[PDB]
Amino acid sequence: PAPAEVQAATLEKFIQGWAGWTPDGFLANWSEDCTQKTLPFSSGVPLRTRADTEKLFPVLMSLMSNFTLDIHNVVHDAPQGKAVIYALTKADTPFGPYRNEHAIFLWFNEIGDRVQKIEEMFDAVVMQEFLPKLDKYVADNKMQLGAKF
Amino acid sequence: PAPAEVQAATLEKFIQGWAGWTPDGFLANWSEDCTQKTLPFSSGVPLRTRADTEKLFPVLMSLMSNFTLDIHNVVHDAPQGKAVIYALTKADTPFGPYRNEHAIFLWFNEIGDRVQKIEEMFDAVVMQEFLPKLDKYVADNKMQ
Numbered sequence: 335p336a337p338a339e340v341q342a343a344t345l346e347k348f349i350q351g352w353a354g355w356t357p358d359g360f361l362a363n364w365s366e367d368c369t370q371k372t373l374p375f376s377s378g379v380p381l382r383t384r385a386d387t388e389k390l391f392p393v394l395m396s397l398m399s400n401f402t403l404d405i406h407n408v409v410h411d412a413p414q415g416k417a418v419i420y421a422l423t424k425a426d427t428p429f430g431p432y433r434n435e436h437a438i439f440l441w442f443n444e445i446g447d448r449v450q451k452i453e454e455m456f457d458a459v460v461m462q463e464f465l466p467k468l469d470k471y472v473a474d475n476k477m478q479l480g481a482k483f
Numbered sequence: 484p485a486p487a488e489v490q491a492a493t494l495e496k497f498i499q500g501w502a503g504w505t506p507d508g509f510l511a512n513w514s515e516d517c518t519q520k521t522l523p524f525s526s527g528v529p530l531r532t533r534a535d536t537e538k539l540f541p542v543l544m545s546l547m548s549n550f551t552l553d554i555h556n557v558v559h560d561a562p563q564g565k566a567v568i569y570a571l572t573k574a575d576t577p578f579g580p581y582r583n584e585h586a587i588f589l590w591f592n593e594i595g596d597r598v599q600k601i602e603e604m605f606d607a608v609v610m611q612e613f614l615p616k617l618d619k620y621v622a623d624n625k626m627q
Contacts, residue, residue: 374584374606409560409567416558418567435523437586457523458607
């Protein structure tokens with residue numbers, strides 16, 4: 335129900351904040367009550383709060399250097415306040431080269447200046463080797479995040 | 484630009500034909516030059532032509548009974564003539580229960596009454612168990 339030009343500006347700011355690869359710069363575009371869901375539902379990963387996200391992303395971005403974002407497809411449904419992005423990522427990690435692809439569904443808030451809900455499906459076969467190394471990493475350094483992956 | 488209502492009718496006919504309610508079926512809504520892409524790109528699967536799909540669907544259909552389609556999200560970008568669907572499927576197969584989830588990206592043709600190309604990302608971890616069973620079934624029975 336937010337204006338389309340307001341939604342489109344948030345969509346671009348969301349992409350630029352993601353490509354900038356800073357926690358504050360990316361989380362600028364998320365509302366205070368934004369949740370993240372990992373798809374598929376069969377994976378059984380619980381919803382992540384904004385507080386979970388604020389702990390996970392600094393760990394993520396400190397371990398992924400030379401981050402590169404390739405935007406492949408953007409689909410914006412302004413009357414519904416929804417958008418979809420298919421993107422490809424790459425980076426260097428202590429665990430070796432990182433390669434991922436994302437299908438990200440977004441919901442804008444009523445004002446349209448923030449993202450209120452995120453559902454994300456990614457390269458699950460490749461990530462079933464990388465994400466557990468992240469969790470083992472967090473445990474070995476006693477970083478006690480209260481959130482996994 | 485293709486009208487949003489024309490595109491929406493194709494979107495609904497695509498979903499209804501996928502669920503099996505439409506007459507003329509799933510493939511009547513695709514252009515003659517429609518292709519299907521298996522996401523992610525890292526999987527290295529070449530595009531499936533319309534002829535490949537017409538060969539492939541009778542094999543899946545024969546192996547799948549009680550097919551059920553659950554639509555979770557539809558995102559329609561009428562200005563660009565694009566749409567995204569997130570759906571959940573289930574069926575009974577000779578290999579046991581089938582469970583899949585789909586993130587399907589759709590491009591409509593210029594007029595808007597047909598699907599011009601498809602890019603699909605599915606439950607890859609679960610499909611790594613199911614898809615090679617299909618190839619073994621095809622090979623064991625000397626198909627194609």
